[PDB]
Amino acid sequence: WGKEGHEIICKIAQTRLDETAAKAVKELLPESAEGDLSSLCLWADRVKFRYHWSSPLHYINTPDACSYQYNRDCKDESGEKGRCVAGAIYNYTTQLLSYKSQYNLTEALLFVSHFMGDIHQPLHVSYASDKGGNTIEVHWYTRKANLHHIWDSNIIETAEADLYNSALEGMVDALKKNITTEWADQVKRWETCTKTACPDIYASEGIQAACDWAYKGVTEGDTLEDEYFYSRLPIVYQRLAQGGVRLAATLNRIFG
Ligand SMILES: *[C@@H]1O[C@H](CO)[C@@H](O[C@@H]2O[C@H](CO)[C@@H](O[C@@H]3O[C@H](CO[C@H]4O[C@H](CO)[C@@H](O)[C@H](O)[C@@H]4O)[C@@H](O)[C@H](O[C@H]4O[C@H](CO)[C@@H](O)[C@H](O)[C@@H]4O)[C@@H]3O)[C@H](O)[C@H]2NC(C)=O)[C@H](O)[C@H]1NC(C)=O
Ligand SMILES: *[C@@H]1O[C@H](CO)[C@@H](O[C@@H]2O[C@H](CO)[C@@H](O)[C@H](O)[C@H]2NC(C)=O)[C@H](O)[C@H]1NC(C)=O
Ligand SMILES: *[C@@H]1O[C@H](CO)[C@@H](O[C@@H]2O[C@H](CO)[C@@H](O)[C@H](O)[C@H]2NC(C)=O)[C@H](O)[C@H]1NC(C)=O
Ligand SMILES: [Zn+2]
Ligand SMILES: [Zn+2]
Ligand SMILES: [Zn+2]
Numbered sequence: 001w002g003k004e005g006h007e008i009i010c011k012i013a014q015t016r017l018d019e020t021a022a023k024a025v026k027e028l029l030p031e032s033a034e035g036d037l038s039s040l041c042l043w044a045d046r047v048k049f050r051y052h053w054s055s056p057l058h059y060i061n062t063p064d065a066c067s068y069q070y071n072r073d074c075k076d077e078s079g080e081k082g083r084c085v086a087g088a089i090y091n092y093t094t095q096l097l098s099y100k101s102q103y104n105l106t107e108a109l110l111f112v113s114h115f116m117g118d119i120h121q122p123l124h125v126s127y128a129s130d131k132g133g134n135t136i137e138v139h140w141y142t143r144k145a146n147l148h149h150i151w152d153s154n155i156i157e158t159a160e161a162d163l164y165n166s167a168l169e170g171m172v173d174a175l176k177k178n179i180t181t182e183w184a185d186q187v188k189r190w191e192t193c194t195k196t197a198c199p200d201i202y203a204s205e206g207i208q209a210a211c212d213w214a215y216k217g218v219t220e221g222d223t224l225e226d227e228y229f230y231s232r233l234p235i236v237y238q239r240l241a242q243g244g245v246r247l248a249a250t251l252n253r254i255f256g
Helices: 003-015 019-028 052-058 085-096 105-118 147-163 168-181 184-191 199-214 226-255
Strands: 060-062 125-127 137-140 143-146
Touching: 003 105, 003 147, 003 168, 003 226, 019 105, 019 226, 052 085, 052 105, 060 199, 085 105, 085 199, 085 226, 105 226, 125 199, 137 147, 143 147, 147 168, 147 226, 168 184, 168 226, 184 226, 199 226
Parallel strands: 060 125
Antiparallel strands: 137 143
């Protein structure tokens, strides 16, 4: 996701942390953050070339099909296994199990926070043939955009201005509201994991949603407007709340 999506995810996550996780996160966050996880949840997007080895870790590429398998899909352009957003979540959550060696646990926190968000972007788990939709040029109303960008940013941004009078906390408060009184049963399931993180579950969901909702109906050159916006906004919200809930659930498990 772009900036809004990651904020929303990390804000939600942070208000769902139990006391020990809440403590850990403050201790790992720099003073410049001022205790706010969401201030640094885009940090990973700023180090793709600083740490060139990190850039495959933001997504998963699948063949032209609506499935994800770890052993098949989790790998970078060198074919190196586990070099994908799923493998990264396993790596960085494992490191945070060490919190009380070789690893910067402030980075692991910032990577895990970001990647938990990214694994929930449907187009961060989608076709390598169109690079997760980046090569599908459409218009977002009057502006040229690619399909990937529409899911990273445009949909959230449009809802932000059109249904929440330019206040993001408007939308955060509404996702939070639906977490406790519409989605309560779903949320319990979203939080369940029998490992420390359950990334392949989230990836499988994402590829399903890329196909059912993101790619669906869309042809190169289309103008996506109200109809697409309104029918796809519910899955965007779904995926933000899920990221939010699973990020918190994961840090609670790790630090507990
Ligand atoms: C799990 O999380 C960790 C922590 O973030 C990640 O660890 C990094 O992994 C990358 C590679 O995937 C490492 O980058 C490589 O570093 C090599 C030398 O590193 C030295 O320097 C570092 C810090 O300066 C020290 O750890 C130590 O002194 C090392 O000796 C370079 O030689 C590599 O570059 C060469 O190979 C690459 C291919 O990887 C080529 O592209 C280049 O052209 C070049 O020839 C490379 O840069 C990085 O240093 C690791 N850091 C640490 C702290 O361990 C894991 O990647 C991550 N895994 C996941 C998410 O799956
Ligand atoms: C652990 O990693 C973090 C982030 O990479 C380091 O914090 C950064 O330090 C650099 C270099 O001095 C600064 O320029 C940045 O402003 C800092 N960023 C953040 C987000 O805090 C931290 O110093 C590292 N810990 C080490 C090396 O022990
Ligand atoms: C929170 O959940 C509510 C209710 O399930 C969603 O509101 C419904 O959604 C449609 C748009 O898809 C509206 O036209 C209906 O009028 C709504 N019903 C009610 C009772 O309000 C709402 O959009 C969800 N909000 C978020 C942020 O997820
Ligand atoms: Zn993102
Ligand atoms: Zn993206
Ligand atoms: Zn990213």
